[PDB]
């Protein structure tokens, strides 16, 4: 099985223990580590952070400890305007320039492949996404003629049915991608004012509409659209989504006034790292949706939907039972990487729990 793990560039700036650099990563934990995110300047792939070349070097040195480890560089991300992707892919000329710049860049910095994170392709982009993937892969096949191992090509894809129907030709891109990571953790819409879990595994007998917003549905749908199980990887979150309650009601349906207050280290309203959640739990009230198989917690007027060792192991077994290629984790820097916040004298408790299940067969 594959265990795809993302590492984010901006995590280096978090204060104190929250600060995470590539060398904190256990070389034997994941099978693939993806660095997020690369930028595109003058239609060419390029660095993002001022010290990226140094961090690229630090990450790729892990391969001197674990020779089987593969690394990829992801282009795009949520702070990358999708309009920019749309513009590059729409014109055969700009598209070709970008494609041509990738192999040399990856080779120079020691990466084994490219991960595409266009979030998200609209109805008018579907056509061009296919061309982009097809042509990128053709370039990689051609570059391998030089005697070096062929570069890998992957893509992170929405798990939302409407988003999938709208911007992706799944059957077509599946044949050219080495693997596809399903973003099965952004299910509760940032649009409404209700409490809800962002990464439920199952539908849950307690609600008719949005039977589409759960991991099981997204996986089944992808398989029906033509994506081979051996290329599908299920996304598992290492963070939680928080809300500020509008009333004393804490159960399903409870009204929301807005996102939860920022975590001390992550400082982003709406989300908390797993290590911050481990601290939050002290004095909190824990619950678990039996139908969806995921937990949530509450303290004061703060409501948090998250994943723990149990739910993560649960998703990993589901994935194996469906014979998928493996799991993808977002993200290493949000798990208890130091292993000092979540009790168990264990580094990367969430990611390790996933690895354990995958190692069972
Ligand atoms: C849950 C989750 O992971 N969601 C992701 C989004 O959070 C993510 O958006 C990213 O948001 C983070 C934090 O909110 C943001 O981090 C900032 O990164 C910049 C660098 O790009 C830092 O700026 C540096 O400051 C120091 C001094 O303080 C300078 O020395 C340095 O030169 C600066 N860098 C630059 C630009 O020159 C900020 O300090 C840091 N701020 C925070 C909040 O700590 C990221 O930039 C956002 N990511 C990107 C790629 O823009 C979103 C990104 O796509 O993806 C989700 O996964
Ligand atoms: C990711 O790539 C972006 C696309 O190139 C880049 O956007 C910006 O690109 C240039 C460079 O800063 C900005 O302005 C130009 O810069 C030169 C100065 O060297 C000027 O002479 C020229 O007139 C022009 O102003 C753009 O304003 C900006 N592009 C936009 C917003 O359309 C991003 O900077 C890059 N991201 C990071 C963090 O590296």
UniProtKB/Swiss-Prot annotation:
Entry's family note: Belongs to the glycosyl hydrolase 18 family.
Gene3D superfamilies per record: 3.10.50.10, Glycosidases
InterPro entries found in the cross-reference section: Chitinase_II/V-like_cat, Chitinase_insertion_sf, Glyco_hydro18_cat, Glycoside_hydrolase_SF, Glycosyl_Hydrlase_18
PANTHER family linked to this entry: CHITINASE, CHITINASE-3-LIKE PROTEIN 1
Pfam families in the cross-refs: Glyco_hydro_18
Organism of provenance: Capra hircus
Residue span(s) of domain GH18: 1-361
SMART domains: Glyco_18
GO biological process terms on file: activation of NF-kappaB-inducing kinase activity; apoptotic process; carbohydrate metabolic process; cellular response to tumor necrosis factor; chitin catabolic process; inflammatory response; lung development; positive regulation of angiogenesis
Glycan-carrying positions: 39, 345
Domain of life according to the entry: Eukaryota
Subcellular location(s) per record: Secreted, Extracellular space; Cytoplasm; Cytoplasm, Perinuclear region; Endoplasmic reticulum
SUPFAM superfamilies: (Trans)glycosidases, Chitinase insertion domain
Coiled coil: none
Subunit structure: Monomer.
GO MF annotations in UniProt: carbohydrate binding; chitin binding
Cystine pairings recorded for this chain: 5-30, 278-342
Function text: Carbohydrate-binding lectin with a preference for chitin. Has no chitinase activity. May play a role in tissue remodeling and in the capacity of cells to respond to and cope with changes in their environment. Plays a role in T-helper cell type 2 (Th2) inflammatory response and IL-13-induced inflammation, regulating allergen sensitization, inflammatory cell apoptosis, dendritic cell accumulation and M2 macrophage differentiation. Facilitates invasion of pathogenic enteric bacteria into colonic mucosa and lymphoid organs.
This protein's GO CC annotations: cytoplasm; endoplasmic reticulum; extracellular space; perinuclear region of cytoplasm
UniProt lineage: Eukaryota, Metazoa, Chordata, Craniata, Vertebrata
Keywords annotated in UniProt: Antimicrobial, Apoptosis, Cytoplasm, Disulfide bond, Endoplasmic reticulum, Glycoprotein, Inflammatory response, Lectin, Secreted, Signal
Residues annotated for chitin binding in this entry: 49-50, 76-79, 120, 183-186, 241, 330
Region of interest (Important for AKT1 activation and IL8 production), residue spans: 302-316
Protein name: Chitinase-3-like protein 1
Keyword Endoplasmic reticulum listed: yes
